[PDB]
Fold Mitogen-activated protein kinase 14.
Amino acid sequence: RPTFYRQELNKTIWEVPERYQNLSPVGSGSVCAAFDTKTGHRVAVKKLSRPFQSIIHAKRTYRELRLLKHMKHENVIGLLDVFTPARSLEEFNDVYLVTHLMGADLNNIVKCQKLTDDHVQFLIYQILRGLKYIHSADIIHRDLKPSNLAVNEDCELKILDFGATRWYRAPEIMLNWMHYNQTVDIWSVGCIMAELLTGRTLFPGTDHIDQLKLILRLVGTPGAELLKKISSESARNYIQSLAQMPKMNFANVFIGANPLAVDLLEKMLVLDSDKRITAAQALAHAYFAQYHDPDDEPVADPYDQSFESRDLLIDEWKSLTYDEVISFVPPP
Ligand SMILES: CC(C)(C)c1cc(C(=O)N2CCNC(=O)CC2)c(NC(=O)Nc2cccc3ccccc23)s1
Ligand SMILES: CCCCCCCCO[C@@H]1O[C@H](CO)[C@@H](O)[C@H](O)[C@H]1O
């Protein structure tokens, strides 16, 4: 066991190994940047807020730890370390996770640099590559947005989840469909891509219903083929009295853009989730001809998420979370 030191950072107590120094808050869990003396690199340390307060908190803590231990891909957040000051299961109450610090989020980059077409190919390529991996573990992000995309000075990107969101959300989620295929994530990529291309938020909705209104103005009101799959009688009625609205031709909307980028956006921003391109299919799209390597777009090992169906006691989730802290093995 290492030697821990304590310190208070903005009305929070932080107890971490001496390994990590120069902690400075960046987020509120809450997150500090820090300097990892063992490598010389900068890290982000997340301290879980109240990890075992309820059964539901306890399950989310275990969820995040299990997920982060599983993710081993260049374009997805990965765990460098996980630690607790606690000397035993009965003492266990705090959880800290450590990852490589990337210097900026994509939101930051989009505001005072107009990206070139080459930049858009590389940034979206990477989000797709990391998504192919996440999806191959039967995980859905569900909140992909520029603030969840950490980017370095070489514009290398990783997907994470800090935890409006609305501007990037698939319309089925905002109408609580409850099913949700993984292409809800592809909807988000289409919104991100549009905004990388134009400099402007695609669907800057003011609230929940304005969000859907703006979405339908671009993509059109549901076509017969979509309406045929709608099981809920209310939904169909809720839909049939919004404005009878045409799909816009995206070629007309994203004026200056590479026609291959317009094509790909048409294949992402389809209302019917069944007809949206998959991350794997997208990686093969000619827009990414300069980046695609089918031998280097890997998939995840199988991910057991049977815990998701289980209704356990706090201390059960807590001993499970403790087990995973102990079995952690750092990357090379
Ligand atoms: C991208 C992917 C793989 C779908 C993630 C899911 C979650 C997650 O927690 N879950 C998302 C799904 N929903 C929930 O129930 C929570 C679990 C992540 N968690 C984090 O990205 N955590 C962190 C965020 C910001 C800073 C960090 C610094 C060091 C370590 C981790 C950090 S990333
Ligand atoms: C008024 C706005 C209408 C939004 C229509 C969203 C339809 C999304 O697409 C649907 O998603 C489901 C997965 O959630 C699938 O089961 C359906 O088969 C598919 O058609």
Remarks:
- Strands lie at 4-8, 13-17, 20-27, 30-36, 41-47, 81-83, 96-100, 104-105, 149-151, 157-159.
